[PDB]
Structures are given as structure tokens and as C-alpha cells.
């Protein structure tokens, strides 16, 4: 216990966290208006951020 100062867990993302990973990576894509990214994020049941 004196060896490691703090351990940090990384969970798989949830529905609120799959949205903004989509939001950041859809920045560099040329999109079309009317997408509803919320419906896209719910199709993936928490795969990862990769």
C-alpha cells in the first residue's frame, strides 16, 4: 500500500459518454444536417472509445 500513490479505474463509456466521443470525432467529418447522433450512440452498447 505504500508503493502506489493512487490507482485510477477507467470504465467503459455509457450513453452520455458515447455521445461526446462521437461529438469530438465528428468534428473533422463533412456532415449533413439532420443526423441525431443520440440514436447512433445508443446502437453501440458501450464498446469502447476506440
Amino acid at each position: 500500500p505504500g508503493r502506489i500513490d493512487r490507482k485510477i479505474e477507467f470504465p467503459p463509456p455509457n450513453e452520455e459518454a458515447r455521445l461526446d466521443i462521437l461529438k469530438i470525432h465528428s468534428r473533422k467529418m463533412n456532415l449533413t444536417r439532420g443526423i441525431n447522433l443520440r440514436k447512433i450512440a445508443e446502437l453501440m452498447p458501450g464498446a469502447s472509445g476506440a
Binding site: 465528428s26 468534428r27 473533422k28 467529418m29 463533412n30 456532415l31
Partner: protein, 184 residues
């Protein structure tokens, strides 16, 4: 914020230039002028308005609330530097200077935006600051300041794709090239 800010500039046009149509326009703008802490942009509009003889307490209740948001910035700037984040003085009022951009004039905006331009190492806050400078430069028709930061905008989009910052940007020249008589 600067997001409902363009309808104000349309209603200033709706106030003055239709000469007979200057009654409901001076009411519904004053419906929004003496609320949401606006102080600076309507002194000469009040000169183009009627007397409105008692506006003194109408100003004093608002310049106090201007100072209230300004003094809690004055209470933020020492608690952010004691245990620092990413310069959280600036990082607080890099979102609260756009308030001061709406509330005060450009001078509180321009000395704080060029402050916080050098803070963020990524353009994802920088290029959103540049959209603020474009939008006030349309209100004050800063036709020589928009020529500077548009190139400084466009120089940021090439790294990354930034299509929500490119297709957003194309509307701004699209409104500027129709502001000037350049239809093609």
C-alpha cells in the same frame, strides 16, 4: 451571450429607419434593452428614441448587477491562482468575457479574448473565440477587423477537418459577401 445578439442589430434597424414605424420597435427592444444587463449599446438609440426621462434608477439597478458579475470575477481571480488549473482566472472569464462582450463594449472583449487566445494550446477554444470576434465585427461593421481574423480563422481549420467550424464559417462570409454588393 452573443447567440441572440444579431436580432438586436435587426431591431435597431427596425427602430430608426422606418420613420413612422418607430413605436412598437422602441417598445419591444426596450423590453430587451433594460433587461439582461445591457448598458452601453443604446445611449444614442435612446437619443433616437423619446425622452424616457426617468431611466436613472433603471440604469442604477443594472450597472450594479453589472458590477455584481464583475466583482465575483474580482472574487474569482485570487482563488483560481492560489491552486491553479489551466489559468482558471482567464479560463473562468474566457466564457464570461462574452457576457462582458454583450454587456460592455468591445474593449472588455478584445483585451480578454486576446488574453485567452494565448492560453489554450488547442484551437478548439481558439477558433471559437475567433467566431466571437467575427460576430461583434458585424455589429460595429468592423470591415477592417474582419479581414484580419477571417484569415486567422481559416489558417486554423487546415489542421483537423473542422467542418462544424468550416461550414459554420462559410455562412459568415456568405453574410458578409451579401453585406457588400458581391453576389457571385
Amino acid at each position: 451571450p452573443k447567440n441572440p445578439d444579431l436580432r438586436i442589430a435587426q431591431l435597431r434597424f427596425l427602430l430608426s429607419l422606418p420613420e413612422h414605424r418607430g413605436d412598437a420597435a422602441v417598445r419591444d427592444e426596450l423590453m430587451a434593452a433594460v433587461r439582461d444587463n445591457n448598458m452601453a449599446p443604446y445611449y444614442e438609440a435612446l437619443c433616437k428614441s423619446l425622452d424616457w426621462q426617468i431611466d436613472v434608477d433603471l440604469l442604477n439597478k443594472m450597472k450594479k448587477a453589472n458590477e455584481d458579475e464583475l466583482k465575483r470575477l474580482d472574487e474569482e481571480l485570487e482563488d483560481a491562482e492560489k491552486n491553479l488549473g489551466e489559468s482558471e482566472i482567464r479560463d473562468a472569464m474566457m466564457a464570461k468575457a462574452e457576457y462582458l462582450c454583450r454587456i460592455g463594449d468591445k474593449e472588455g472583449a478584445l483585451t480578454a479574448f486576446r488574453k485567452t487566445y494565448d492560453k489554450t494550446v488547442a484551437l478548439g477554444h481558439r477558433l471559437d473565440i475567433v467566431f466571437y470576434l467575427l460576430r461583434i465585427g458585424l455589429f460595429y461593421m468592423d470591415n477592417d477587423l474582419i479581414t484580419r481574423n477571417t484569415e486567422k480563422a481559416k489558417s486554423l481549420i487546415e489542421e483537423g477537418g473542422d467542418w462544424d467550424r468550416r461550414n459554420r464559417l462559410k455562412v459568415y462570409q456568405g453574410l458578409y459577401c451579401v453585406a457588400i454588393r458581391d453576389f457571385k
